[PDB]
């Protein structure tokens, strides 16, 4: 299935694009001409950090975030598969410590 992922920049900028349930959100976003922050691109850091508003993803391919951070809604967009329509706020790296 292909879902619709809506992103919210650190200033209210929004972007809504198609996101195959078997494609990482970071890649689905770039396909639609959306520039997002990233570093390793392999779920090893926090540069691509984002935070769920609604929906859910499978980011098990990632290992940087702990259960607690993931409980709160934090997701590594470079290794996240949308499991449904979602609303995600980007550039959340600054909240992680």
């Amino acid at each position: 299935a292909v879902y619709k992922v809506k992103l919210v920049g650190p200033e209210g900028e929004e972007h809504e694009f198609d996101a195959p349930d078997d494609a990482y959100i970071l890649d689905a976003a770039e396909t639609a001409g959306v520039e997002l922050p990233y570093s390793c691109r392999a779920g090893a850091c926090s540069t691509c950090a984002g935070k769920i508003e609604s929906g859910s993803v499978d980011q098990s391919d990632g290992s940087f975030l702990d259960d607690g951070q993931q409980e709160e809604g934090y997701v590594l967009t470079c290794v996240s598969y949308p499991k449904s329509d979602c609303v995600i706020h980007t550039h959340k790296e600054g909240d992680l410590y």
Binding site: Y24, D27, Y38, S39, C40, R41, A42, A44, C45, D61, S63
Partner: protein, 309 residues
């Protein structure tokens, strides 16, 4: 003369390969060789590992490989080890000009009681020791390739590239330089300026010196190479010499290049950046510029490339 490389169809791809192999289903690769890169005086071991992926896990320079060491996650029973990322140190053709292998530059992570100075093998790096302990024939769980931040900008074959590295951070640059100078790649004839700054602990810790010193002889007009041996050299004020200190010795020269459109890259452990940034800040100010503004502009121009960890 440049070394013939094959197969050329590895130049045909327009977009770089990404995540060809995921953690749940990694590719089983074979170790071709492992060798220490350092001498007895090096603080620790850093090894060169050649891996045979048989053309199944191709990549572009600047990208990295994922390796999943055997055993289970000590933090999650029943679960396999987390993948460790490693900057590929070889061109896409590999050390065999094969297009069949890739290489990693791995620093052995070891633990030492802060006092008795004795190493506790039970507390050292799992994947790094696993890798440097490997022998020809060993199988390795490979994932990737991954990354885009360190892809080499080739639109301008005469572009300028300033490479700042520390320790294993030299890996992607070894990949750039073999491509610019050692390999016979018809569609990429580098004619710009490649400048490599490498900071290590001592000379016994130098990585691939014979290789880089070689470029200084073959292309004096296209390759500059400055090393910093921290435990053997000193800066202007008597303290240990670091890469930012060497960058400072060519401050005006380096800022010109940046002002002229030069690409600058940083790679290695992340504790190398604070000092680097402070030095850049002080250099921009001694020139009357705002570092924050210049950084923002450099990033805007896509000239700033960082891969620290």
């Amino acid at each position: 003369s440049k070394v013939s490389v094959a197969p050329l169809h590895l130049e045909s791809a327009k977009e770089p390969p990404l995540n060809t192999y995921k953690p749940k289903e990694p590719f089983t690769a074979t170790i071709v060789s492992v060798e220490s890169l350092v001498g007895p005086k090096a603080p620790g071991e850093t090894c060169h590992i050649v891996i045979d992926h048989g053309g199944n896990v191709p990549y572009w320079e600047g990208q990295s490989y994922g390796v999943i060491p055997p055993g289970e996650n000590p933090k999650k029973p029943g679960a396999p080890q987390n993948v460790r990322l490693y900057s590929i140190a070889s061109t896409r053709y590999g050390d065999n000009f094969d297009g069949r292998t890739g290489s990693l530059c791995v620093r052995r992570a070891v633990y030492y009681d802060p006092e008795t100075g004795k190493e506790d093998p039970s507390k050292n790096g799992v994947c790094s020791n696993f890798l440097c302990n490997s022998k020809p024939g060993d199988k390795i769980q490979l994932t990737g390739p991954s990354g885009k931040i360190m892809l080499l900008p080739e639109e301008d074959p005469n572009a300028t590239h300033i490479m700042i590295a520390t320790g294993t951070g030299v890996a992607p640059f070894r990949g750039y330089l073999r491509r610019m100078f050692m390999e016979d790649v018809p569609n990429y004839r580098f004619g710009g300026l490649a400048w490599l700054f490498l900071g290590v602990a001592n000379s016994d810790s130098l990585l691939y010196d014979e290789e880089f010193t070689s470029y200084l002889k073959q292309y004096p007009d296209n390759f500059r190479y400055d090393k910093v041996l921290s435990r053997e050299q000193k800066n202007r004020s008597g303290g240990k010499m670091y890469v930012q200190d060497k960058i400072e010795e060519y401050s005006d020269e380096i800022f010109k290049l940046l002002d002229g459109g030069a690409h600058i890259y940083f790679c290695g452990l992340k504790g190398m950046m604070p000092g680097i940034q402070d030095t850049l800040k002080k250099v921009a100010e001694r020139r009357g510029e705002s570092w924050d503004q210049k950084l923002a502009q450099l990033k805007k121009n896509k000239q700033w490339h960082v891969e620290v960890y």
